[PDB]
Amino acid sequence: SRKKMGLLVMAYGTPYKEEDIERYYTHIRRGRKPEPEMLQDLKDRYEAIGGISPLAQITEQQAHNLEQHLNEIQDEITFKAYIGLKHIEPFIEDAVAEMHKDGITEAVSIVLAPHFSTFSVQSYNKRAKEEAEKLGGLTITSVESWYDEPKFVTYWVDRVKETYASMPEDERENAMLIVSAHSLPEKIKEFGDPYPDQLHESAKLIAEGAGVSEYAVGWQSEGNTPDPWLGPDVQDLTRDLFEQKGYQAFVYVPVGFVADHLEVLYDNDYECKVVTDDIGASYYRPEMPNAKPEFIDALATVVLKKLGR
Ligand SMILES: Cc1c2[nH]c(c1CCC(=O)O)/C=c1\[nH]/c(c(C)c1CCC(=O)O)=C\c1[nH]c(c(S(=O)(=O)O)c1C)/C=c1\[nH]/c(c(S(=O)(=O)O)c1C)=C\2
Ligand SMILES: [Mg+2]
Ligand SMILES: [Mg+2]
């Protein structure tokens, strides 16, 4: 009775083992293999956050859980999840090829990043649809952004509320909320890319919902290319806000990210933490969505809304 549909889940990607680090970063750096010192640095970063292998399992678990949940919450469509990654196998084109091989003719895609950008989301979507057209007989409808899905906003609002609620009286009254996503080259502005606007909307929505009056928008994890790169970077923003107003606690909500990967566990929980430790402030970073039922239900709602269901 049910309509068979592909569920194409797209993400940045993460190495599966320490031995994947070289090729993963080469790919991110557009063919420029890291020198031995940087490679070792990277290995040490992964070791410090507790290993690489758990990290890559989250994306699999997200996709699996989302398929299962969508299949249970409605009765018209049977979804089959396929993972398509930007920087490591299974690549986006691999996933689309597999769907076509498997007799999928109709699919919905979603990127595990809630904000639209020309660099990330739009590129993934183009690549997916281009491989589908190349093979023929397979259409894909693509989610573009979902940062404003009420269930997703509520996820973050509730975590933020719990964080503040757990603070001592003096910290709660003198805290700063820093809402962040992955930095991108500043040149996206020439296309009128709404990515920066969507992050400030995300921050607005979360702060408003949590009853947080003092918040700021920051960027993190920028690459090293000759052009900038959206700023301010969270490290610089943290110190600057402290110098400006003396905040005693900083709460990091890397809303651009959906899971416990290197950008959060290292770029917040180490890099921002060094800064908060230095200035004498408490560090807080609520739990990432990961594969949690509340988050999977938000994603389910996003997918079905896109389908008009
Ligand atoms: C060393 C290097 C990096 N990135 C590039 C280079 C070598 C080219 C040059 O600088 O002349 C180059 C690019 N990154 C780009 C683009 C459009 C280029 C130009 C490519 C060309 O035409 O040659 C985009 C880009 N890049 C990154 C992302 S994002 O993570 O999805 O946000 C995106 C969208 C990520 C990184 N690129 C990096 C690094 S890292 O310094 O940490 O090793 C990172 C974390 C480094
Ligand atoms: Mg960095
Ligand atoms: Mg620069």
Swiss-Prot record:
Modulation of this protein's activity = Stimulated by Mg(2+). Inhibited by Cd(2+). Inhibited by N-methylmesoporphyrin (N-MeMP) and 2,4-disulfonic acid deuteroporphyrin IX (dSDP).
Name the reaction it catalyses.
Fe-coproporphyrin III + 2 H(+) = coproporphyrin III + Fe(2+)
Positions binding Mg(2+) in this chain are 19, 45, 267, 271
Look up what happens after changing residue 182 to A/C.
Answer: Loss of activity
- What does the record note on quaternary structure? Monomer. Interacts with frataxin/Fra.
**Protein name stated in the entry:** Coproporphyrin III ferrochelatase
Q: Which residues bind Fe-coproporphyrin III?
A: 12, 29, 45-46, 53, 124
Taxonomic source organism: Bacillus subtilis (strain 168)
The record's annotation in Pfam families points to: Ferrochelatase (PF00762)
What EC identifiers does the entry list? Answer: 4.99.1.9
| Consequences of knocking out this gene | Deletion mutant requires hemin for growth.
Q: Which residues bind N-methylmesoporphyrin?
A: 12, 30-32, 182, 187
Q: What class of enzyme is it?
A: lyase
CDD domains of this UniProt entry? Ferrochelatase_C, Ferrochelatase_N
Question: What biological-process terms (Gene Ontology) are attached?
Answer: heme biosynthetic process
Binding residues for Fe(2+), per the UniProt record?
Answer: 182, 263
Subcellular location, principal: cytoplasm
Classification via PANTHER family? FERROCHELATASE (PTHR11108), FERROCHELATASE, MITOCHONDRIAL (PTHR11108:SF1)
Has keyword Lyase?
yes
User: Which GO-annotated molecular functions does the record name?
Assistant: ferrochelatase activity; metal ion binding
InterPro entries for this protein: Ferrochelatase, Ferrochelatase_AS, Ferrochelatase_C, Ferrochelatase_N
